Design a protein around this ligand. Structure first.
Ligand code: HEM
Ligand SMILES: O=C(O)c1ccc(-c2ccccn2)cc1
Ligand SMILES: [Cl-]
Length: 393
């Protein structure tokens, strides 16, 4: 019934060039079995979307990595939002929704846009930059920790902790095990900054604590919800912005459309999230025997979703391998779908829009002038280095 494949979606060969293997996974059937890790997989849009929108059957409380929390100990206390099912998930979800709300975006937009314009101006003075370290990393590092209300000391732990979190969703391979081995200094830093005394008033972190009054969360839950934003809100945006810059360098015709209408900035970032999804894969666990696309999956089985594959599925998208900044992108799963759909997507979009708007208004060309290096992660997709020359407009 279910085809068995030996493709390892957590191998460097797969990270290097996942597209061909993803077509193989999509075309083999709606549900495959991956013998390498003894998990089910779904690579088509329809099944990925269906799994995401059935949290009762495909739960998150048993972890969204390979590890099954009913069988193995989590490497850190479970997330109160990501690794929770309704109804436990509902109230921490509503709090983060209100912290990361439209009204909060109105308060940070001017500073985020000023910082993005200032960065592009700074980068234009140097001409030849690394679009990862000097842009995709430097810009969110200059707005997000300040938006959280973090102190200055110790921010070098932020990206390492994030890379650890997303590597840890993988199998016990060298990427995951190495990350955990070096994790103690990053965990200590992050956990300490999650305490209310260490969070600046007016920031995202202090606002989470300020919601402990309402009956939605208690004070003992607030540090873990701060930890959620420090886990999921930095490295994802770095890879998203890097993907957008990468796309604009590979598709100069799309950079030229963006220059002619900077108001396409928000959709050009959204298309980059569909085209080069920063988070390529993660898991659900079945809570019972379920039929999916004509196949029966037993209870307590891990199901690997290929989000980047669903976003390139020609059963859903026309010309899926083309970066199109006027594409109707609604429905892509780059931010998830359903009750867990990225609660910080307004922050991601704001960061990405104002950066691409700054590029649209100030940059004439983006040419790759050096070797492009990929950054390897069990679930994140992004570049290690992207040497580009920026031609000022
Ligand atoms: C390009 C940027 C981003 C991408 C591609 C992305 C992707 C995702 C995806 C796919 C999920 C769903 C996970 C699941 O269903 O198991 C998710 C959830 C989440 N994201 Fe994002 N994210 C981004 C930016 C952010 C930012 C900026 C924040 C916070 C400031 C954030 C915080 C969270 C949190 C807390 C969750 C858990 C929500 C829940 O379980 O209900 N992410 N993200
Ligand atoms: O609550 C946390 O700590 C946390 C929340 C969300 C993520 C995540 C996972 C997969 C894709 C995107 N984001 C990771 C951690
Ligand atoms: Cl931790």
């Amino acid at each position: 019934t279910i085809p068995h494949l030996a493709i390892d979606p957590f191998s460097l060969d797969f990270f290097d060039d996942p597209y061909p293997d993803q077509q193989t996974l999509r075309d083999a059937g709606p549900v495959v079995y991956l013998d390498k890790w003894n998990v089910y997989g779904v690579a088509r849009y329809a099944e990925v979307h269906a799994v995401l929108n059935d949290p009762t059957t495909f739960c998150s409380s048993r972890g969204v990595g390979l590890s099954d929390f009913k069988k193995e100990k989590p490497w850190r206390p479970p997330s109160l939002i990501l690794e929770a099912d309704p109804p436990a998930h509902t109230r921490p979800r509503a709090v983060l929704s209100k912290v990361l709300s439209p009204a909060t975006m109105k308060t940070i937009r001017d500073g985020f846009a000023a910082a993005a314009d200032a960065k592009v101006d700074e980068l234009l003075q140097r001409g030849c930059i690394d679009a990862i370290a000097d842009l995709a990393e430097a810009y969110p590092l200059s707005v997000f920790p300040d938006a959280m209300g973090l102190k200055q000391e110790g921010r070098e732990h932020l990206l390492p902790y994030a890379g650890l979190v997303f590597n840890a969703f993988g199998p016990p391979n060298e990427l995951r095990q190495t990350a955990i081995e070096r994790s103690a200094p990053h965990q200590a830093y992050v956990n300490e900054q999650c305490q209310r005394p260490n969070l600046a008033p007016g920031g995202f972190g202090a606002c989470i604590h300020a919601f402990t009054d309402t009956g939605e969360i208690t004070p003992d839950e607030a540090p873990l919800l701060v930890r959620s934003l420090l886990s999921a809100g930095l490295d994802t945006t770095v890879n998203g912005i890097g993907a957008a810059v990468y796309c604009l360098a590979r598709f100069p015709g799309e950079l030229q459309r963006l220059r002619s209408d900077p108001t396409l900035a928000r959709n050009a970032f959204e298309e980059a999230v569909r085209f080069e999804s920063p988070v390529q894969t993660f898991f659900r666990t079945t809570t019972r025997e379920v039929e999916l696309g004509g196949a029966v999956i037993g209870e307590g089985e891990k199901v690997l979703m290929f989000l980047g594959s669903a976003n390139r599925d020609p059963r859903r998208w026309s010309d899926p391998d083309l970066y199109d900044i006027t594409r109707k992108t609604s429905g892509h799963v780059g931010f998830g779908s359903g009750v867990h759909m990225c609660v910080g997507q307004l922050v991601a979009r704001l960061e990405g829009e104002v950066m691409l708007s700054a590029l649209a208004r100030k940059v004439a060309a983006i040419d790759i002038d050096g070797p492009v290096k990929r950054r390897f992660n069990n679930t994140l997709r992004g570049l290690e280095s992207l040497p580009v020359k920026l031609t000022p407009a």
